[PDB]
Design a protein around this ligand. Structure first.
Ligand SMILES: Nc1nc2c(ncn2[C@@H]2O[C@H](COP(=O)(O)OP(=O)(O)OP(=O)(O)O)[C@@H](O)[C@H]2O)c(=O)[nH]1
Ligand SMILES: Nc1nc2c(ncn2[C@@H]2O[C@H](COP(=O)(O)OP(=O)(O)OP(=O)(O)O)[C@@H](O)[C@H]2O)c(=O)[nH]1
Ligand SMILES: [Ca+2]
Ligand SMILES: [Mg+2]
Ligand SMILES: [Mg+2]
Lengths: 89, 166, 166, 88
């Protein structure tokens, strides 16, 4: 990790927020979720039950948290890659 | 993550190796071991960006074949003298001109370094000599440093990096 | 191996944390997260001795009971202002007087630090202002630094170690 | 609604930080605040847990992440409550 970063817009529908964040492509998905949690300023209940989620480009899905973020290629519609943070339980 | 090829030049004994090792490893080399050619790689953060510095620490002003090679491949040059030795200061003008002739331009990332500034009781080269020289070198960057005191060491290499990004 | 308890003090937003994290970790903290009290330990080589530095990075004046315990226990003090905020420079006087009251003497290892010297366009506190203040504090050590540019960062902590050693 | 100041030591970084923690929220959320205050300086960060170190009449133990923070009475050693952040 460490060498690079990529800007990704992250939508949190339960907060009706989106945030653009720098995420580490060579880090696990769980560390990208860690960055999203630290950007929300503890505004989420049961936040640890939320997971990063790829919208349909089709049909969506939660990202495997053990995978490196770069294992999920970006959607090339958007100028910035787009992910969602949704309740996973 | 970009690579920066930095070259440390100067006459023998001015502290080219001590500066390099102080910056790379954080220790002061009290020995004087005459250098043929040593290289070091270190990942540092400069101006919010991760950078891979490759620092080339050279022989005295000597091993001419290698000298032509690191002048064509180097991106930034620190020209080092000792404030205790007037001749090592006088030696730098020739170096600066050799570099520019090989790069075929005067727009060459460069920094002038007066090392051993902790040795005030042995200073022969005034700070203003180095300032005036640097001014003549098209307002070249200039620093007085001490590898022994770790004063203005990282500032040398980080300034080269900023010059290369410009 | 000797231990040195250093304390970074100043008003809020001047760069206390960024100077500390820059020195200890080599990264620049672009965020402003208000500190209550942060501690860092780091082994370095200073004047060819291995040294254990304990750096206490403190809050902005807030936490007045906590202040007396880190003033009694600190061995050396960095008094930090920002060259872009006059108010943070004026606050440093009542801060030094409190160190002298608590420790009962004026021979306290101390350095005055004007931080954010990379922000020349926003300078409000002239360099001579800082030099004058240091002089009236019993010829106190004085540096202008930049945590963002990594200029004069380690020089702050190495100089306190040297004052403690003397 | 509430907040209290707790000094958290991270031995693997050799650092300590005073943090405002919510006593009425679960321990995992207090761990979330510790994580956010380290930026990303800790490798393998999620294998760390909040730990109550040994102290006077008190053995060391990892805090149960599903209990509310306030269900662990603070140690009486220090002026501020002290916890550590330790690898598992
Ligand atoms: N007092 C003092 N001595 C220094 C300083 N820097 C280097 N020296 C000493 O000067 C001697 C020569 O240092 P080197 O770093 O080997 O000089 P150099 O010939 O330019 O380096 P090489 O590329 O290895 O040949 C060594 O004994 C150093 O310890 C300094 O800043 N202060
Ligand atoms: N341009 C510039 N900005 C700086 C510099 N140092 C700190 N800053 C910024 O100024 C703001 C204040 O930084 P802090 O280090 O948090 O200041 P502090 O309040 O003294 O430190 P704390 O102990 O955490 O309260 C941050 O956003 C820093 O990024 C600097 O040298 N140059
Ligand atoms: Ca320095
Ligand atoms: Mg040598
Ligand atoms: Mg801060």
């Amino acid at each position: 990790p460490g060498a690079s970063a990529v800007v990704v817009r992250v939508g949190i529908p339960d907060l009706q927020q989106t945030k653009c964040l720098r995420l580490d492509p060579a880090a696990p998905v769980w560390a990208a979720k860690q960055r999203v949690l630290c950007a929300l300023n503890h505004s989420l209940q049961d936040a640890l039950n939320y997971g990063l989620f790829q919208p349909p480009s089709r049909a969506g899905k939660f990202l495997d948290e053990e995978r490196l973020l770069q294992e999920y290629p970006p959607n090339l519609d958007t100028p910035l890659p787009y992910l969602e943070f949704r309740y996973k339980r | 993550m970009r690579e920066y090829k930095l070259v440390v030049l100067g006459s023998g004994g001015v502290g080219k190796s001590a500066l390099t090792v102080q910056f790379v490893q954080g220790i002061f080399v009290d020995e004087y071991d005459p250098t043929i050619e040593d290289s070091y790689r270190k990942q540092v953060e400069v101006d919010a960006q991760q950078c891979m510095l490759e620092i080339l620490d050279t022989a005295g002003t000597q091993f001419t074949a290698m000298r032509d090679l690191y002048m064509k491949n180097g991106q930034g040059f620190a020209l080092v003298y000792s404030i205790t030795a007037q001749s090592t200061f006088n030696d730098l003008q020739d170096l600066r001109e050799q570099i520019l002739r090989v790069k075929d331009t005067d727009d060459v990332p460069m920094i002038l370094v007066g090392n051993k500034c902790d040795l005030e009781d042995e200073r022969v080269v005034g700070k203003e000599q180095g300032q005036n020289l640097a001014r003549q070198w098209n307002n070249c960057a200039f620093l007085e440093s001490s590898a022994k005191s770790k004063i203005n060491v990282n500032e040398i290499f980080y300034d080269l990096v900023r010059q290369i990004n410009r």
